[PDB]
C-alpha cells in the first residue's frame, strides 16, 4: 500500500520461551509482557552505563566479562548477585569450551 | 565453504539474543570496543533475572488465582520478594494495587 | 478550556478514595486543598518537562514515550504504558 | 504480632486465625512453635507457581465440530 | 436499642478493603485531561495530548498520592493520632525532600 | 443399630475433597479417598487407645479434652485452644 | 435446555480460595463421633466422649489431613505432575516416618 | 570381554555391595577436625576438643548424610528418573521438617 | 612470627570421593554435580548448630573443653539419640 | 583488633556534639546505640563498594577517588577531597 514502514525490536519470543522453560502449561498477558520488556531494557541500560563508567574510571576502553561481573555485583544485592555471577561464569565456560 | 552456522543462543545454551545485545553495546555509544564474553554474561544475567521474576510472578498469581500474569501479580511478587523490592525501589507498576501491609493502631475496638 | 474549575476537578470523594486505597481511614478538611496543590505542582513540572522534550523533538504532540522519559528523568520509572 | 495480623485482617478482637497468621508470618515464631497447631484457624496462601490456569490451550482438544 | 446505624471507621475500613483488593482507577479521565490541557496552555499554545500519555500521567499521580497518604498516615500514627493533618503533609514533604 | 461398616464411609468424598482444597490440592485422584480414610482411621485408633489408657489410669470412664490434649502432646502434636 | 454443569481447575481454585479465606469446619460432627465411638468400642465397652474432646480430635484430624495433602501436592509438583497419587501418599508417609 | 572398556553402571553395583557390608569411617578424621575447629572458632576461642567428641560428631554426620542420600534416592526414583538432583534434596529436607 | 591457622579450605575438606562413598553406602548409584556443594552446606549448618549447642553446654558447665558427654546430650536434645560413645 | 571496641568507638559525647551541631538539644538514651548501628551499616556498605571498586581496578589500597566514586554512585556527591 505505502512505501513500507519500520519494525521495532522486543524480547517477546525470548520471554515466552523462558516462561515455558521455567513453568509448563504457562502463559502471560500483553501488559505483563510489556512490563517485563521495559524492566529488561532498563536493567540492560543501567548495567551498560555502569560498565561504561567502570571502563572510563579504570583508564581502559574494552568492556569485558570482568566489567560486566563488577557492574552486576554493584547493581544486584547479595544472593541474587552471586547466582547471576555463577550463571555468567558457567555461560563463559560453556562458550570457551564450545563455540 | 561456509559449511554451517549455529546460532549464538544455541552455542551458549541461553535463550537471549546475544547478537542483538552485542549490536546494542556497539551502537549504544557505551564504549569503542565490545568484548566477547560480556554479551554472553549480560544475556545469562538477564535470563536468570527474567526467570526468577517469572517464578515470583507465578507465585503471586497462584496466590491471587487468575488465568494470566497481570501487573497486580507482578507488584505482589515485587513487594513480596525482599531482594526485588530492594532492587526496584523507585519502580512503580501501573495498573496495580498495593499490599495490605499495615501497623496495629488504627483498628476498631 | 480557560476555567478555574480545574483545581476542583479532583473531587473530594476522589481524594478520599485515594487516601483509603493508600491507608488512611479519616481524612481532615484542609487535606484536599493541599493535595490538589501538590498534584497541580507535580503536573506542572511534568508537563513543562514534556513540553521541553516535544520542543526539542520538533513536534507539537506530547507522547507517552516523552512522558515516560520525563518521569524517568525526574526519578519515577513507570512501566506498562510504553517501552 | 497478633495485632499486626489483626490489622492485616481487620477485626474487632484477636482471633485464633490472626494468631496463626502472626505465627506463620514471624519466622522466629514459626521456628519456635513448629509442632503447634492453632485450632479454629486456617492456613496461609503460601503456594508455588505451577498449578496455575495458563494451559495456553495448546491444541489438546480434538473434535470441536 | 443498639445503634442500628453503622459506627464510623468500620465502613471506611471496608472501603479501604474494596479499593485495595481491586485494580480499577479512581481519578476521572476527562477532568484530568482538561486539567493537563489547561496546564500545558500556560507554556505552548495549540497543544495536543495522547490517551496513553494521560493514562500514564493519571496512574503516576495516583501512585504518588497513595504514597503521600501512606506517609502522612504513618506520621499520624507515630504522633499518637488517627487522622492526617496539613502539618503532617508539610512535614512529610519536608522529610522526603519535596519542599525544603 | 449403628453400622460399623458405615463409618469409614462417614468421611464423605466431598469432605475429603474440601480438605484437599483447603490444604492446596486442585485435582484429587480416585484412590486418594480410601487411603485418606485408612490413615485417618489408624490415627484415630491410636489417639483413642492412648485416651482410653489415660482414662483407665485416671480411674474414670469418660474421655476428656484434657486427656485428649495430653495424648496429642505425648504423640508429638501440641494443640491449643481446647483446654489449658 | 442446558442446565449448566461445572469443570475443574478454575472452580477448584475458587473453592481453595473460599476454604482458605474462611475458618469454618469441613468434617461433620456426629459421623465423627460415631466413628470414634465405634473405635473406642473395640477397647473398653460402655465408653462416653466429650463435645470439646471430639471437637479437638476433629480439628487435629483436619490439620493432619491438610498437612498430608500439602505434602502430597508438593511431591506431585516435584514429580512433574498436577495431581496426587496413592504412591505419592505412600512416599510422603515413608519420608515423614509414619510407615511404622 | 576386553580389559580396556568398562560398562558404566556395573562397577557401581560392586562398589555399593562392598561398601554396604563394612562399618569403617568414610570421611577422614583430619579434614573433619579442622572443620570442627574452624566452626567452633566463631562461637568461642581457646577451645580444646576431646578425642572422643570428634569421633561421635563424624559418626552422626555420616549417619545423617547416609539418611539424606537414601531419602534423595527415594525421591528421585519417584519422578521416573534414576539419578539424584539438587531439586530433590530440598524437597526431602522440607518434607522431613528440617528447612520448614 | 611463625603463624599458620585454618582457612576456607574447610568446606572443601569433605572431598568429593568421600561424599560419593557416603552416597554409595546410603543407596545412591549416580551422584550429580551440584550435590556435593549442597551436602557440604547442609553438613556445615548441622555442625554449626551442634557446635553452638556444645559451646553453650560447656559455658553453662564452667569449662573450656567440649566433651563427648556434652555432644551426646546436645544430640539427644536435638532429636538424635546416639549410643556407643558415652553413657 | 578487638571485635567489640569499635561500635563504642563513636563516644557518647561525640554523638551528642553531632546532634547539637545538627539541631538537637536533648538526646535520649537509646539514641546512641541506634546511631552507632546506622553508622556501622552505612560504613559497611561504603567499604564494600570501595572494596569492589579496588578489586575491579586490580589494586589493594582504597583511594579517596574510589570513595568519592562510591559515594556518588550511592547518591551523595562529595566535594573538596578529590576531583
UniProtKB/Swiss-Prot annotation, chain A:
Its main location: nucleus. The modification N6-glutaryllysine is found at residues 8, 17, 20, 82, 90, 94. Monoubiquitination at Lys-8 (H2BK34Ub) by the MSL1/MSL2 dimer is required for histone H3 'Lys-4' (H3K4me) and 'Lys-79' (H3K79me) methylation and transcription activation at specific gene loci, such as HOXA9 and MEIS1 loci. Similarly, monoubiquitination at Lys-94 (H2BK120Ub) by the RNF20/40 complex gives a specific tag for epigenetic transcriptional activation and is also prerequisite for histone H3 'Lys-4' and 'Lys-79' methylation. It also functions cooperatively with the FACT dimer to stimulate elongation by RNA polymerase II. Phosphorylation at Ser-10 (H2BS36ph) by AMPK in response to stress promotes transcription. It comes from the Eukaryota. The modification Phosphoserine is found at residue 10. The modification N6-malonyllysine is found at residue 90. The modification N6-acetyllysine is found at residue 59. The modification N6,N6,N6-trimethyllysine is found at residue 59. The modification PolyADP-ribosyl glutamic acid is found at residue 9. The modification N6-lactoyllysine is found at residues 17, 59, 82, 90, 94. GO terms for cellular component: cytosol; extracellular space; nucleoplasm; nucleosome; nucleus. The modification Omega-N-methylarginine is found at residues 60, 66. The modification Phosphothreonine is found at residue 89. It is found in: Nucleus; Chromosome. Belongs to the histone H2B family. This is Histone H2B type 1-K. It comes from Homo sapiens. The chain holds residues 28 to 126 of 126 of the full protein.
Swiss-Prot record, chain D:
The modification N6-(2-hydroxyisobutyryl)lysine is found at residues 10-11, 31, 54. GO terms for molecular function: DNA binding; protein heterodimerization activity; structural constituent of chromatin. It is found in: Nucleus; Chromosome. Its main location: nucleus. The modification N6-crotonyllysine is found at residues 54-55, 61. One of its GO terms (biological process) is protein localization to CENP-A containing chromatin. The modification N6-(beta-hydroxybutyryl)lysine is found at residues 31, 54. It comes from the Eukaryota. There is a cross-link at residue 55 (Glycyl lysine isopeptide (Lys-Gly) (interchain with G-Cter in ubiquitin)). The keyword Thylakoid does not apply. GO terms for cellular component: CENP-A containing nucleosome; extracellular exosome; nucleosome; nucleus. The modification Phosphothreonine is found at residue 56. Keywords: Acetylation, Chromosome, Citrullination, DNA-binding, Hydroxylation, Isopeptide bond, Methylation, Nucleosome core, Nucleus, Phosphoprotein, Ubl conjugation. The modification N6-glutaryllysine is found at residues 31, 54-55, 61. The modification N6-succinyllysine is found at residue 31. The keyword DNA-binding applies. The modification N5-methylglutamine is found at residue 40. Monoubiquitination of Lys-55 (H2AK119Ub) by RING1, TRIM37 and RNF2/RING2 complex gives a specific tag for epigenetic transcriptional repression and participates in X chromosome inactivation of female mammals. It is involved in the initiation of both imprinted and random X inactivation. Ubiquitinated H2A is enriched in inactive X chromosome chromatin. Ubiquitination of H2A functions downstream of methylation of 'Lys-27' of histone H3 (H3K27me). H2AK119Ub by RNF2/RING2 can also be induced by ultraviolet and may be involved in DNA repair. Belongs to the histone H2A family. The nucleosome is a histone octamer containing two molecules each of H2A, H2B, H3 and H4 assembled in one H3-H4 heterotetramer and two H2A-H2B heterodimers. The octamer wraps approximately 147 bp of DNA. The chain holds residues 66 to 130 of 130 of the full protein.
UniProtKB/Swiss-Prot annotation, chains E, G, H:
The modification N6-glutaryllysine is found at residues 21, 44, 80, 87. The modification N6,N6,N6-trimethyllysine is found at residues 1, 21, 44. Its main location: nucleus. GO terms for molecular function: cadherin binding; DNA binding; protein heterodimerization activity; structural constituent of chromatin. The modification Phosphoserine is found at residues 22, 51. GO terms for cellular component: extracellular exosome; extracellular region; membrane; nucleoplasm; nucleosome; nucleus; protein-containing complex. The keyword Nucleus applies. The modification N6-acetyllysine is found at residues 1, 21, 44, 80, 87. The modification Phosphotyrosine is found at residue 6. Changing residue 1 to I: Found in pediatric undifferentiated soft tissue sarcoma samples; uncertain significance; somatic mutation; results in global decrease of H3K36me2 and H3K36me3 levels and increased H3K27me3 levels. The modification N6-(beta-hydroxybutyryl)lysine is found at residues 21, 44, 87. The modification N6-succinyllysine is found at residues 21, 44, 87. It is found in: Nucleus; Chromosome. The modification N6-(2-hydroxyisobutyryl)lysine is found at residues 1, 21, 29, 44, 87. The nucleosome is a histone octamer containing two molecules each of H2A, H2B, H3 and H4 assembled in one H3-H4 heterotetramer and two H2A-H2B heterodimers. The octamer wraps approximately 147 bp of DNA. Interacts with TONSL; CHAF1A; CHAF1B; MCM2 and DNAJC9. Interacts with NASP; NASP is a histone chaperone that stabilizes and maintains a soluble pool of Histone H3-H4 dimers. It is linked to Glioma: Gliomas are benign or malignant central nervous system neoplasms derived from glial cells. They comprise astrocytomas and glioblastoma multiforme that are derived from astrocytes, oligodendrogliomas derived from oligodendrocytes and ependymomas derived from ependymocytes. This is Histone H3.1. The chain holds residues 37 to 136 of 136 of the full protein.
Swiss-Prot record, chain F:
The modification N6-propionyllysine is found at residues 13, 26, 59, 61, 73. Acetylated as part of spermatogenesis progression prior to histone-to-protamine exchange. The modification N6-succinyllysine is found at residues 13, 59, 61, 73. Changing residue 80 to H: In TEBIVANED3; results in early developmental defects when expressed in zebrafish embryos. Changing residue 27 to C: In TEBIVANED3. The modification N6-lactoyllysine is found at residues 13, 59, 73. The modification N6-methyllysine is found at residue 2. There is a cross-link at residues 2, 13, 41, 61, 73 (Glycyl lysine isopeptide (Lys-Gly) (interchain with G-Cter in SUMO2)). The modification N6-(2-hydroxyisobutyryl)lysine is found at residues 13, 26, 41, 59, 61, 73. Changing residue 57 to R: In TEBIVANED4; results in severe early developmental defects when expressed in zebrafish embryos. It is found in: Nucleus; Chromosome. The modification N6-glutaryllysine is found at residues 13, 41, 59, 61, 73. Its main location: nucleus. The modification N6,N6,N6-trimethyllysine is found at residue 2. Changing residue 73 to E: In TEBIVANED2; results in severe early developmental defects when expressed in zebrafish embryos. GO terms for cellular component: CENP-A containing nucleosome; chromosome, telomeric region; extracellular exosome; extracellular region; membrane; nucleoplasm; nucleosome; nucleus. It comes from the Eukaryota. Keywords: Acetylation, Chromosomal rearrangement, Chromosome, Citrullination, Disease variant, DNA-binding, Hydroxylation, Intellectual disability, Isopeptide bond, Methylation, Nucleosome core, Nucleus, Phosphoprotein, Ubl conjugation. This is Histone H4. It comes from Homo sapiens. The lineage of its organism: Eukaryota, Metazoa, Chordata, Craniata, Vertebrata. The gene is H4C1.
Amino acid at each position: 500500500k505505502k512505501r513500507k514502514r519500520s519494525r521495532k525490536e522486543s524480547y517477546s519470543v525470548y520471554v515466552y520461551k523462558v516462561l515455558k522453560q521455567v513453568h509448563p502449561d504457562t502463559g502471560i498477558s500483553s501488559k505483563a509482557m510489556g512490563i517485563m520488556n521495559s524492566f529488561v531494557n532498563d536493567i540492560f541500560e543501567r548495567i551498560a552505563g555502569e560498565a561504561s563508567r567502570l571502563a572510563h574510571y579504570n583508564k581502559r576502553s574494552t568492556i569485558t566479562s570482568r566489567e560486566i561481573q563488577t557492574a552486576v555485583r554493584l547493581l544486584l544485592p547479595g544472593e541474587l548477585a552471586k547466582h547471576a555471577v555463577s550463571e555468567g561464569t558457567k555461560a563463559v565456560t560453556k562458550y570457551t569450551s564450545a563455540k | 565453504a561456509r559449511a554451517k552456522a549455529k546460532t549464538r543462543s544455541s552455542r551458549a545454551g541461553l535463550q537471549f539474543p546475544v547478537g542483538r545485545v552485542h549490536r546494542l553495546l556497539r551502537k549504544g555509544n557505551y564504549s569503542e570496543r565490545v568484548g566477547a564474553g560480556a554479551p554472553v554474561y549480560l544475556a545469562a544475567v538477564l535470563e536468570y533475572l527474567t526467570a526468577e521474576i517469572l517464578e515470583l510472578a507465578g507465585n503471586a498469581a497462584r496466590d491471587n488465582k487468575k488465568t494470566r500474569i497481570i501487573p497486580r501479580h507482578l507488584q505482589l511478587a515485587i513487594r513480596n520478594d525482599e531482594e526485588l523490592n530492594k532492587l526496584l525501589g523507585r519502580v512503580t507498576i501501573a495498573q496495580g494495587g498495593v499490599l495490605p501491609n499495615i501497623q496495629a493502631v488504627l483498628l476498631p475496638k | 478550556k480557560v476555567l478555574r474549575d480545574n483545581i476542583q476537578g479532583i473531587t473530594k470523594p476522589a481524594i478520599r478514595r485515594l487516601a483509603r486505597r493508600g491507608g488512611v481511614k479519616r481524612i481532615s478538611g484542609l487535606i484536599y486543598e493541599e493535595t490538589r496543590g501538590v498534584l497541580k505542582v507535580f503536573l506542572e513540572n511534568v508537563i513543562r518537562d514534556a513540553v521541553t522534550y516535544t520542543e526539542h523533538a520538533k513536534r507539537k504532540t506530547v507522547t507517552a514515550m516523552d512522558v515516560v522519559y520525563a518521569l524517568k528523568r525526574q526519578g519515577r520509572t513507570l512501566y506498562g504504558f510504553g517501552g | 504480632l497478633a495485632g499486626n495480623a489483626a490489622r492485616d485482617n481487620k477485626k474487632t478482637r484477636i482471633i485464633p486465625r490472626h494468631l496463626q497468621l502472626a505465627i506463620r508470618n514471624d519466622e522466629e515464631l514459626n521456628k519456635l512453635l513448629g509442632r503447634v497447631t492453632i485450632a479454629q484457624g486456617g492456613v496461609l496462601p503460601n503456594i508455588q507457581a505451577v498449578l496455575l490456569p495458563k494451559k495456553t490451550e495448546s491444541h489438546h482438544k480434538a473434535k470441536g465440530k | 436499642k443498639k445503634p442500628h446505624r453503622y459506627r464510623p471507621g468500620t465502613v471506611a475500613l471496608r472501603e479501604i478493603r474494596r479499593y485495595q483488593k481491586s485494580t480499577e482507577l479512581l481519578i476521572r479521565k476527562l477532568p484530568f485531561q482538561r486539567l493537563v490541557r489547561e496546564i500545558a496552555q500556560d507554556f505552548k499554545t495549540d497543544l495536543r495530548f495522547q490517551s496513553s500519555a494521560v493514562m500514564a500521567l493519571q496512574e503516576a499521580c495516583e501512585a504518588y498520592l497513595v504514597g503521600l497518604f501512606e506517609d502522612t498516615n504513618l506520621c499520624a500514627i507515630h504522633a499518637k493520632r488517627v487522622t492526617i493533618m496539613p502539618k503532617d503533609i508539610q512535614l512529610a514533604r519536608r522529610i522526603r525532600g519535596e519542599r525544603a
